[PDB]
Amino acid sequence: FSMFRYSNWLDKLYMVVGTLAAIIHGAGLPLMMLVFGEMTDIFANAGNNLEEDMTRYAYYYSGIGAGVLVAAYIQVSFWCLAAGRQIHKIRKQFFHAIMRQEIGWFDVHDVGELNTRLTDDVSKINEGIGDKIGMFFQSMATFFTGFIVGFTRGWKLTLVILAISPVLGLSAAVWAKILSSFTDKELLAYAKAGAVAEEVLAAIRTVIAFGGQKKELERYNKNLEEAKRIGIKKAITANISIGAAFLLIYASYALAFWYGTTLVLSGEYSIGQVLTVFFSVLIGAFSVGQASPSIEAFANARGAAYEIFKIIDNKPSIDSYSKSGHKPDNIKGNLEFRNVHFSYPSRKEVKILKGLNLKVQSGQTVALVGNSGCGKSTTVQLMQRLYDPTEGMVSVDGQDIRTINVRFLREIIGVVSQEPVLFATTIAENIRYGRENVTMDEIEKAVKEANAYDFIMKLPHKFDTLVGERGAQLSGGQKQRIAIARALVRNPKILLLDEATSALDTESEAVVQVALDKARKGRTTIVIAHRLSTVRNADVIAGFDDGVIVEKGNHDELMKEKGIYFKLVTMQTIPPVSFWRIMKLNLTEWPYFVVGVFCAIINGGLQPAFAIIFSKIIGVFTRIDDPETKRQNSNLFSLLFLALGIISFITFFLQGFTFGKAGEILTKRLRYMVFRSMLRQDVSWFDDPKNTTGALTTRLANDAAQVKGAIGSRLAVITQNIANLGTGIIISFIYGWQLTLLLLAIVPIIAIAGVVEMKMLSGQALKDKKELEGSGKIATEAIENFRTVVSLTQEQKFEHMYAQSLQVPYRNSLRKAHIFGITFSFTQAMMYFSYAGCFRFGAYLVAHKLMSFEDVLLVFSAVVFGAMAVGQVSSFAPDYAKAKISAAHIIMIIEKTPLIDSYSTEGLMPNTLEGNVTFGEVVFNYPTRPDIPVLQGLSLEVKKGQTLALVGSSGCGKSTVVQLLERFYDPLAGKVLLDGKEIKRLNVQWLRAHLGIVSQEPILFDCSIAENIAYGDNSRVVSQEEIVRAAKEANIHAFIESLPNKYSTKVGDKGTQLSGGQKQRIAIARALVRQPHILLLDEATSALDTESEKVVQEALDKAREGRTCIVIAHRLSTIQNADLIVVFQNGRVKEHGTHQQLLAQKGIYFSMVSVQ
């Protein structure tokens, strides 16, 4: 698919113009470098009126700069405009094709997947075809023209440098590869801690219940230590990579200078040729290096566009836009289904359509009946030509549906949905979606007919009341009535309705049926319902039989047939922070920083040195003296580069280690704190949806690289850049003030250029995303509702709406492209103009003997290359912004304290528990929904060694009394006391330990069963004999013994490797491990291996002595086996007493007992 662009041949011309502009820019840059070589050559010749020659050279520079400006502007602007046009056209085509797809197609592919496809794949195509291609062409042109210039102006020096450059390229690529490998290794290493934390957090309730936080913390600490080791290895790898790159480039500089000095000293081509060839070839090498991102982006776009086109290329089986069918004018009611054989393509194996015979005459209110899953609604669905008949015949008025206008057919048949979908627009908007030619008079008549006026009239702008998100504005009965009105507005020839009002309420069903069946003489009707009333009104009713109709007759005929109809009838009855505070790594890295900065400063001083040293290697030739001594002097500088490069390397190496450790240590310590901080938190905190277990895990994981960068990387980059630029500026001022001042006041233009470019890129991205979302609202609202859309045959109208929503931001995109192109062209031409002005001024000074030409080169190179290196390093280190906000979030979380400090040693800790509990007036309001109280201040009490049972209502806090008993919260109002001990005053540790809570679905860590059982008895060692005794008590010791490896078996995740009953028994045994004085069990019986469940319940009862057990269950006999029972009614204790007294009374307990 090398040619994946297919739109607007004129756009092809625009793209070719952009390509030519890219070639021009690429050729231009080394052309500027060659002109620099010539200027240097003339400057050196002047070592003996020069100003004129300098002015001529400056004129050449200005011409090339203007050419560069125009060429870069053309490149970026033309490519971006072409991309905008291409993306607009392809997005329109893609949405239209999606609308064209078949119902089966949309069913097969996930709707969310396709919506995300539209949202993201097109944008990725744009990004990979927008401008990066222009950059690729420009880089290729720069490489080729650099080589051409090097060859033209030199043969030997060019050859040596071209033979050297691949070494540097290979070294850089190899270092990148090893860095990526180390990245993968570090990810895999930390995955262990990640899994540990995920398991712990997923079991936060049980984790806090068993007080095993310490063990999990220790394991996480060990994993974190391993991950820190690997991360430090990665950091040293990356830093040594950068150092090796610096060493290679400086070695290239040194060898180039040595060879060039050898040549020029030999009377060969002058120094200017050396400078031009060296710089041009080096720039070519770096550009061919920079080429890669464009290729990567284009490959990603290749893949995405391949998928998109494959979606587009698929010609559908049914083409709603195709008008190759016959469109009769007068439609006479006559429906024929003959041996309709077919199935759901989703699972073609089944055959729901097992052939069907049915003939309906005109003006018949036919109806279908049958058991759920008999395909009664599938017949109607096929009636709309939503699917195709695998083997059979379907026709209306004696003509095959396939041989008729698909769009016309679908618009000549009206349908009603059991759960109608309504377009998220005004009531008038919804009616228009139903049909635009309503004239608003028949619309009002239909609105009146459907009996939907109260909801419409009450709402603001009665006839134009909008529908909120997902139809929350109107009522379900209102929604059904609106749907019926919309269907009727089309005045179809065949109505197909299912569950008119059989979803939630029947009150509006009477009016709905009255209005629907009222006007059906000229509109044949198919009705699917689930109530006897709707069945009775049927005129001709057909019963379904395995996708076949056996019973066919009226109500009386069906009743006399004694079919399934009669069977049913009888059965029918972002806080901020301070950089000073954030530097917590002081406690750790204080011995580290002093090293790194010292190294970093040296590196900051390394680059400016290269300037002055380089300057001297030029100055040595500019001097008229030029004796043989220079041959020695050149060496004195040449080898320096080599040594200099080593220095450049060496510091980084050291800098890698120290800082690599400094950050790495933090990654450990911070984690070891934050996770702990998370554990020392109340259950309510986790209850917040924001603190989602997965989200908390990710934050615990995806923050090391953020905080490390914010603390260390930011400081290192700031010190390095500051040292480098300050050294350069100060040295320049020492050796020059005029050119120094001009350059210092000119560089900020470049700084503004770069900053504005980045800011414009970010802002344009955000704005484009915003407008794209504005259009995607319409797109998704017209994709998630695809079935009802095709039923409405309004696809074209939604296509026009999306076309408008895209035309709105298309112009904005084009204008943004133009603006970005102009800004980029200015940024690129600024450097050329600055070189022109700086060298013109340098001549204007040296001619007046104000500054040595060597001094001019010194100042220029120092300042400009310092700016370049500073920008590069700044763009190298991790971003401060995201790192800063991540540090803020983690600081907020770690510093945040709980309302109940489980680690607080103070608290009433009586030696022994009395087994007395009294919960009175305890009002429970969950922090998730504090406006929805769950406990109504119920009243209850249990004595020592007393077994109580609950009769709470569904989702009324029946089990919450254990939850509150678990101390996972605090009583909002009222009181709960244990053995006359203040629950608030009771130490959280002691209370949590002394209670044997049993959860409704007790989770277990995926480790050895021995550890899982042992972990319950925290704060002490539980001998294997105690574990065996507990397992026998829970009736699990025998099962474990039969299991190979006994208690050492690696229990599968969530206990999957073991039977659910086995897992519950293991959890009960663990609970019994702590020999709890007061215990709680919640829905532990269910059915649960009814024999095994009964055995477990019997064992628990046998071990109920010497402990008070609070039991919540759905088994009648277990509740009766309790010592006492407490009823619940909206959080109110209706009654409390024994089984006999409770049953005798008229209380809900008797009815519940009679239920089973």
Ligand SMILES: COc1ccc(CCN(C)CCC[C@](C#N)(c2ccc(OC)c(OC)c2)C(C)C)cc1OC
């Ligand atoms: C990266 O793109 C460019 C590269 C070079 C140039 C101009 C001429 N260069 C020979 C000097 C600048 C590049 C420079 C060197 N040498 C350099 C850049 C990046 C580096 O990190 C990989 C580096 O150290 C290895 C050195 C100097 C900053 C010290 C302009 C550029 O902008 C287009």
Ligand SMILES: Nc1ncnc2c1ncn2[C@@H]1O[C@H](COP(=O)(O)OP(=O)(O)OP(=O)(O)O)[C@@H](O)[C@H]1O
């Ligand atoms: N996308 C689907 N792919 C496969 N089977 C499906 C799909 N949607 C529904 N089904 C099932 O296929 C059968 C089609 O039944 P259909 O609804 O058309 O008729 P019905 O007699 O009114 O039954 P029901 O209303 O209980 O589904 C049902 O068993 C339904 O659950």
Ligand SMILES: Nc1ncnc2c1ncn2[C@@H]1O[C@H](COP(=O)(O)OP(=O)(O)OP(=O)(O)O)[C@@H](O)[C@H]1O
């Ligand atoms: N952390 C929480 N935040 C908000 N609501 C909660 C929370 N935990 C439970 N609930 C709600 O409290 C009720 C659960 O209480 P409880 O389990 O004691 O009653 P239940 O009758 O045994 O429950 P179920 O009918 O679910 O088996 C449900 O409404 C549940 O939505």
Ligand SMILES: [Mg+2]
């Ligand atoms: Mg159905």
Ligand SMILES: [Mg+2]
């Ligand atoms: Mg419950």
